[PDB]
Amino acid sequence: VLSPADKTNVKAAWGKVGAHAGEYGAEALERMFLSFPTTKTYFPHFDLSHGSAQVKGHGKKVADALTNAVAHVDDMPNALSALSDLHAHKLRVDPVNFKLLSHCLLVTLAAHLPAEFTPAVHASLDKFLASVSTVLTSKYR
């Protein structure tokens, strides 16, 4: 459950990504595919090599989905209903994978945005990414 501080922290941290959203989204995917190779099973149709056009393009969608989620932080079940249908109804993604992607997203943010990645922001983004994960892995329609 997001506190006012968390929502504020996430908006400021994610807003600092801006143009570099797709690339951090693509790197978080590559970090997940390397560290946790079982997550690769969800993408058999993907070329998962380095500098992949599919992973780069998928990373952009993931980051734009997170952007949209930031802009609708108080209304994610309605704003992310299409992605909840995708990951919970169609893909049936085990929620452990959402924890691993979230962690990899946090690792990517930690590496590229050190000045922004404070303990408070880390806490707030972890809560945000956990809130989003709950919405995408839940069947609620």
């Binding site: 790197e27 590559e30 970090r31 390397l34 560290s35 946790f36 962690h103 990899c104 946090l106 690792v107 990517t108 930690a110 590496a111 590229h112 050190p114 990645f117 404070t118 303990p119 408070a120 880390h122 806490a123 972890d126």
Partner: protein, 146 residues
């Protein structure tokens, strides 16, 4: 834990460059900030009410150095983490009553701190090798429930 000679070298290389005074206290600090329930086990530390009070607390910093040293010990004995964390698994399980899920939580926070400290040098293959190491440490510390 098993690691390729290339992963073993990438791990040793970055770990030799670790700021022993800051990384541990940061990993423990961030554990207490990101997972506030972990602050219950560290009541004797005093003020842990804000991230600033947690990160500037000398007990967090000193205990974090101890934690980092236990991780270093783990890395020096990868082939026997179970034996290495025998008494340490006893203390956490049977005397501190720490839920093992928390060991996985601190392992990932350390990785976040390594990413934060080393930046672009903490590459996806370097992260992957550290994930095997911290999962091994988390598991070896859990062993007393096993």
């Amino acid at each position: 834990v098993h690691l390729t000679p290339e992963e073993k070298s990438a791990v040793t290389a970055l770990w030799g460059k670790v700021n022993v005074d800051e990384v541990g206290g940061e990993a423990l600090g961030r554990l207490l900030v990101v997972y506030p329930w972990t602050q219950r086990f560290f009541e004797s530390f005093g003020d842990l009410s804000t991230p600033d009070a947690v990160m500037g607390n000398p007990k967090v910093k000193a205990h974090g150095k101890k934690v980092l040293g236990a991780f270093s010990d783990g890395l020096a004995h990868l082939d026997n983490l179970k034996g290495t964390f025998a008494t340490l698994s006893e203390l956490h399980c049977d005397k501190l009553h720490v839920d093992p899920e928390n060991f996985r939580l601190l392992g990932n926070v350390l990785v976040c701190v390594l990413a934060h400290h080393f930046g672009k040098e903490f590459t996806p293959p370097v992260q992957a090798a550290y994930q095997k190491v911290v999962a091994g440490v988390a598991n070896a510390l859990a062993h007393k429930y096993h």
